């Protein structure tokens, strides 16, 4: 489908860093890809990897509304 797989940029295409689940280095920052349904909405990119990871896992399991 639409697949918002962003656009693999030269300075940072889709660097999975070190297997961080849903955290890929985009534009130098850490973006997350995971939606509650079937899409893939990207995060505003955080300077901290775990900050984007947690938000990604929460919006996935709880689907936006955390518990």
Curated annotation (Swiss-Prot):
Keyword DNA-binding: yes
One BP term from GO: cell division
Coiled coil: none
Molecular-function annotations in GO: DNA binding
Domain of life per record: Bacteria
Keywords: Cell cycle, Cell division, DNA-binding
Keyword Cell division among UniProt keywords: yes
Family: Belongs to the CedA family.
Biological role stated in the UniProt entry: Activates the cell division inhibited by chromosomal DNA over-replication.
Entry protein name: Cell division activator CedA
Species name: Escherichia coli O157:H7
Taxonomy of the source species: Bacteria, Pseudomonadati, Pseudomonadota, Gammaproteobacteria, Enterobacterales
First-to-last residue of the parent protein present: 14 to 80 of 80
